């Protein structure tokens, strides 16, 4: 009965760690494919002008 709780809690913690790791992977993928034009000014506006 005691060890059941530890298994459950460990499951949640491992899930959380995996979530963080994948979030870092996503940001790395992003910057690999993205910075060339990141945060630049909106072209729709200027074309309209």
């Amino acid at each position: 009965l005691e060890r059941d709780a530890l298994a459950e809690r460990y499951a949640t913690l491992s899930f959380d760690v995996q979530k963080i790791q994948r979030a870092h992977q996503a940001f790395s993928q992003f910057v690999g494919k993205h910075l060339s034009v990141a945060f630049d000014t909106d072209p729709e506006a200027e074309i309209r002008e």
């Binding site: 790395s28 910057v31 690999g32 993205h34 910075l35 060339s36």
Partner: protein
């Protein structure tokens, strides 16, 4: 010509520091997407090291 000239020293400084940064790195850079690819590789290695 004036626009190209105003952009000339900016371009030259870009190339200069690009060469310096390229030499500071083991891998040699050749294109913008290549630069960003190297950057994400650098982040990956940093994460593993920490």
């Amino acid at each position: 010509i004036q626009s190209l000239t105003a952009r000339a020293p900016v371009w030259l400084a870009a190339q200069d520091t690009l060469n310096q940064l390229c030499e500071q790195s083991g891998e040699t850079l050749a294109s913008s997407n290549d630069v960003t690819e190297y950057m994400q590789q650098l982040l990956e290695r940093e994460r593993e090291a920490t």
